[PDB]
Design a protein around this ligand. Structure first.
Ligand SMILES: N#Cc1sccc1CC(=O)N1CCC[C@H](C(N)=O)C1
Ligand SMILES: [Zn+2]
Length: 139
Protein backbone atom coordinates (compact mmCIF):
# COMPACT_ATOMS: atom_id res chain seq x y z
CA UNK A 1 0.00 0.00 0.00
CA UNK A 2 0.94 3.67 -0.43
CA UNK A 3 0.11 6.89 -2.26
CA UNK A 4 1.57 10.26 -3.49
CA UNK A 5 -0.05 13.49 -2.18
CA UNK A 6 0.65 16.52 -4.39
CA UNK A 7 -1.55 19.63 -4.28
CA UNK A 8 -5.23 18.59 -4.22
CA UNK A 9 -4.40 15.14 -5.73
CA UNK A 10 -3.84 11.62 -4.40
CA UNK A 11 -2.02 9.17 -6.75
CA UNK A 12 -2.48 5.43 -6.02
CA UNK A 13 -2.15 2.03 -7.83
CA UNK A 14 -5.43 1.69 -9.76
CA UNK A 15 -5.84 -1.94 -8.52
CA UNK A 16 -5.72 -0.71 -4.89
CA UNK A 17 -8.04 2.36 -5.30
CA UNK A 18 -10.84 2.64 -2.70
CA UNK A 19 -14.60 3.54 -3.06
CA UNK A 20 -13.69 7.12 -2.01
CA UNK A 21 -10.98 7.30 -4.71
CA UNK A 22 -13.48 6.23 -7.42
CA UNK A 23 -16.18 8.65 -6.04
CA UNK A 24 -13.65 11.56 -6.29
CA UNK A 25 -11.99 10.34 -9.55
CA UNK A 26 -9.86 12.85 -11.56
CA UNK A 27 -8.15 10.42 -14.00
CA UNK A 28 -7.38 6.71 -14.30
CA UNK A 29 -5.47 4.55 -16.74
CA UNK A 30 -5.69 0.69 -16.56
CA UNK A 31 -2.75 0.40 -18.99
CA UNK A 32 -0.54 2.28 -16.41
CA UNK A 33 -2.11 0.84 -13.19
CA UNK A 34 -2.65 4.48 -12.01
CA UNK A 35 -5.63 6.33 -10.50
CA UNK A 36 -5.66 9.96 -9.29
CA UNK A 37 -8.42 11.21 -6.98
CA UNK A 38 -9.13 14.66 -5.46
CA UNK A 39 -8.45 15.54 -1.78
CA UNK A 40 -9.79 18.20 0.71
CA UNK A 41 -6.28 18.69 2.24
CA UNK A 42 -3.09 20.01 0.63
CA UNK A 43 -0.37 17.59 -0.48
CA UNK A 44 3.29 18.52 -0.16
CA UNK A 45 5.15 15.87 -2.19
CA UNK A 46 7.37 17.18 -4.93
CA UNK A 47 7.18 15.39 -8.27
CA UNK A 48 10.55 14.95 -10.05
CA UNK A 49 10.68 16.44 -13.63
CA UNK A 50 13.76 14.65 -15.01
CA UNK A 51 15.23 11.58 -16.78
CA UNK A 52 17.02 10.08 -13.70
CA UNK A 53 17.68 6.37 -13.92
CA UNK A 54 18.91 5.97 -10.27
CA UNK A 55 16.96 6.51 -7.06
CA UNK A 56 15.79 4.92 -3.77
CA UNK A 57 12.53 3.02 -3.16
CA UNK A 58 10.66 2.00 -0.01
CA UNK A 59 10.15 -1.77 0.34
CA UNK A 60 7.46 -2.52 2.97
CA UNK A 61 8.14 -6.33 2.93
CA UNK A 62 11.61 -5.55 4.32
CA UNK A 63 10.84 -2.22 6.23
CA UNK A 64 13.83 -0.79 4.31
CA UNK A 65 14.78 1.67 1.57
CA UNK A 66 16.96 0.34 -1.29
CA UNK A 67 19.05 2.23 -3.88
CA UNK A 68 18.35 1.05 -7.50
CA UNK A 69 19.23 1.68 -11.14
CA UNK A 70 15.99 1.55 -13.20
CA UNK A 71 15.00 1.40 -16.87
CA UNK A 72 13.35 4.25 -18.89
CA UNK A 73 9.49 4.13 -18.89
CA UNK A 74 8.31 1.56 -21.44
CA UNK A 75 5.66 -1.06 -22.44
CA UNK A 76 6.39 -4.23 -20.52
CA UNK A 77 4.42 -7.54 -20.50
CA UNK A 78 2.70 -8.29 -17.14
CA UNK A 79 1.29 -11.73 -16.19
CA UNK A 80 -2.46 -12.07 -15.49
CA UNK A 81 -3.69 -11.38 -11.90
CA UNK A 82 -7.13 -11.04 -10.15
CA UNK A 83 -6.95 -7.33 -11.09
CA UNK A 84 -5.97 -7.62 -14.81
CA UNK A 85 -5.68 -10.12 -17.70
CA UNK A 86 -2.18 -10.65 -19.26
CA UNK A 87 -1.23 -7.35 -20.99
CA UNK A 88 1.43 -4.71 -21.75
CA UNK A 89 1.65 -2.11 -18.96
CA UNK A 90 2.84 1.28 -20.25
CA UNK A 91 5.11 3.86 -18.55
CA UNK A 92 6.70 1.06 -16.43
CA UNK A 93 10.37 1.10 -15.20
CA UNK A 94 12.17 -2.06 -13.99
CA UNK A 95 14.96 -2.48 -11.44
CA UNK A 96 16.73 -5.44 -9.85
CA UNK A 97 15.34 -5.54 -6.31
CA UNK A 98 13.07 -7.24 -3.87
CA UNK A 99 9.31 -6.79 -4.07
CA UNK A 100 6.14 -8.70 -2.93
CA UNK A 101 2.46 -7.81 -3.85
CA UNK A 102 1.87 -5.82 -0.65
CA UNK A 103 4.83 -3.64 -1.72
CA UNK A 104 2.73 -1.80 -4.34
CA UNK A 105 2.45 1.87 -3.50
CA UNK A 106 5.99 2.26 -2.12
CA UNK A 107 7.57 5.45 -3.46
CA UNK A 108 10.60 5.64 -5.73
CA UNK A 109 12.50 8.95 -5.30
CA UNK A 110 15.50 10.55 -6.91
CA UNK A 111 17.34 13.81 -5.88
CA UNK A 112 14.60 15.82 -7.73
CA UNK A 113 11.60 14.29 -5.88
CA UNK A 114 8.96 11.57 -6.41
CA UNK A 115 9.56 9.46 -9.56
CA UNK A 116 6.81 6.81 -9.25
CA UNK A 117 5.30 4.01 -7.18
CA UNK A 118 5.85 0.22 -7.00
CA UNK A 119 3.35 -1.50 -9.33
CA UNK A 120 4.85 -4.93 -10.36
CA UNK A 121 7.42 -7.47 -9.10
CA UNK A 122 8.71 -10.99 -8.93
CA UNK A 123 11.81 -13.02 -9.83
CA UNK A 124 14.16 -10.50 -8.21
CA UNK A 125 12.74 -7.57 -10.17
CA UNK A 126 10.64 -4.59 -9.09
CA UNK A 127 8.55 -2.44 -11.48
CA UNK A 128 7.57 1.21 -10.87
CA UNK A 129 4.70 3.12 -12.50
CA UNK A 130 6.25 6.45 -13.65
CA UNK A 131 4.47 9.74 -12.71
CA UNK A 132 7.07 12.28 -14.02
CA UNK A 133 5.19 12.89 -17.30
CA UNK A 134 1.91 13.92 -15.49
CA UNK A 135 2.72 17.61 -15.68
CA UNK A 136 -0.86 18.54 -14.61
CA UNK A 137 -0.24 17.13 -11.08
CA UNK A 138 1.47 20.52 -10.30
CA UNK A 139 -1.21 22.99 -11.53
N1 LIG B 1 5.43 -10.75 -6.80
C1 LIG B 1 5.15 -9.64 -6.84
C2 LIG B 1 4.74 -8.27 -6.92
S1 LIG B 1 5.73 -7.04 -6.30
C3 LIG B 1 4.59 -5.85 -6.70
C4 LIG B 1 3.51 -6.38 -7.29
C5 LIG B 1 3.59 -7.80 -7.43
C6 LIG B 1 2.54 -8.65 -8.10
C7 LIG B 1 2.35 -8.09 -9.50
O1 LIG B 1 3.30 -7.92 -10.25
N2 LIG B 1 1.08 -7.80 -9.85
C8 LIG B 1 -0.13 -8.12 -9.08
C9 LIG B 1 -0.98 -6.87 -8.84
C10 LIG B 1 -1.19 -6.08 -10.13
C11 LIG B 1 0.14 -5.77 -10.83
C12 LIG B 1 -0.06 -5.01 -12.13
N3 LIG B 1 0.51 -3.82 -12.19
O2 LIG B 1 -0.69 -5.51 -13.07
C13 LIG B 1 0.82 -7.10 -11.12
ZN1 LIG C 1 15.63 12.95 -11.03
Amino acid sequence: SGAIYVGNYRVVNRHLATHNDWANLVWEDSSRDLLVSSTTAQGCDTIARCDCQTGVYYCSSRRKHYPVSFSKPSLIFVEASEYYPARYQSHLMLAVGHSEPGDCGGILRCQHGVVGIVSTGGNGLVGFADVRDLLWLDE
